[PDB]
Amino acid sequence: TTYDVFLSFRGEDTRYNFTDHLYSALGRRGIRTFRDDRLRRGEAIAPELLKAIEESRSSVIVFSENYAHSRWCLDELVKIMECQKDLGHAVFPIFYHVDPSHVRKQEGSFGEAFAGYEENWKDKIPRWRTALTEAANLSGWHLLDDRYESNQIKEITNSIFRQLKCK
Amino acid sequence: TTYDVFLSFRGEDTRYNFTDHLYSALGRRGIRTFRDDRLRRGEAIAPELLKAIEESRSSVIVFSENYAHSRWCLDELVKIMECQKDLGHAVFPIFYHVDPSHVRKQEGSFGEAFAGYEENWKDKIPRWRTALTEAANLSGWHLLDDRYESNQIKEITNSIFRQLKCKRLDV
């Protein structure tokens, strides 16, 4: 493998702030992290991203309000969960100012997302919901905005350090 | 002195996110920083805070959208600038997603703040306006969004480290 962690996130929500601080915190701890910063286009997710997932020991998912509003994010998650079943791929979900149960049940913003998918992407929805529901039933961290964010990140990155580095 | 840096910020804007990440970054560089996290009440600014500024080698000001909407922030800033004239207090302003000239000239959100001060705090406005205007003419960093924030922070704290270490070595 190439990376200790693959960072899956919604750029529109958290690219330049939370996920960047998280990315940087991971590196300071010697946790090699892939955080996509390339310009990308096309309807289908980039092969380079699917490969990076496969070459990562684990993924960190930054679930944010509009994460499911991105098809690339969802496809990402389907791939990540495949690696979870088939490889030894560890998965650490972060619920960033979103109710974990909304992700599990696709309610709230996540529900609005899938509503938009009904007419043109109906066949991919099943694998998407399943991957979404599976990831969200894993033990992760529910983060609120009422707390010091660097302490939230330190807690997250220490727990990942313990699981990936201490062996 | 007791601290290398006194962190002045508007809690409501940046307490739990940016200023916190800044705070933590400063600590990592061995920059002893005072960042107020106590419960405080009462109309007048806490004496512990004014003392803290006097016992700090410098202040970092996180100017944010609603900074001037807090009299405590403004009274804070006046003290900071006074220590700057009378003591050897260094001052590093960060313009966090706000236009430096809005601060300097009290336009935009900063102008709106002062409108509200007109009726009950008219007499304090002059030294407040002076402290904002002076502080904003110190060389600092204007931070926009759409930029990687941890890098913005690394850049700021690297510069502050070099400047505080050079100040100390020249003395």
Domain B1-171 architecture: 3-Layer(aba) Sandwich (3.40)
A51 touching B (Cβ < 8 Å): no
Integer Cα distance of B54 and B82 in angstroms = 9
Chain A segment 126-165 residues within 8 A of B by beta carbon are 145-151, 154
Q: Could you give the strand order of the β-sheet that contains B33-34, starting from the edge strand earlier in sequence?
A: B33-34, B3-9, B56-63, B90-96, B141-143
Q: What share of chain A is helix, strand, coil (3-state, %, to 5)?
A: 50, 15, 30
What one-character-per-residue DSSP string does B110-142 give? HHHHHHHHTTTSTTTHHHHHHHHHHHHTS--EE
The Cβ-side half-sphere exposure at A114, using a 13 Å CA radius, reads 19
**Per-domain boundaries in chain B:** 1-171
Q: Which helix (H) or strand (E) holds A86?
A: helix A71-86
Which residue has tokens 């892939």?
A: A34
* C-beta neighbour count of A17 within 10 angstroms: 18
- In CATH, A1-167 is 3.40.50.10140: yes
Chain centroid, CA A137 distance in Å: 13
At B3, list the tokens. Answer: 């601290």
Looking at residue B29, what DSSP letter applies? T
A23 to B150: CB separation less than 8 angstroms, yes or no = yes
CA A117 to chain centre: 20
Which of A112, A114, A143 is CA-nearest to residue A130? A114
Cβ distance B20 to A145 less than 8 Å, yes or no, reads: no
Is there a binding annotation on residue B130? Answer: no
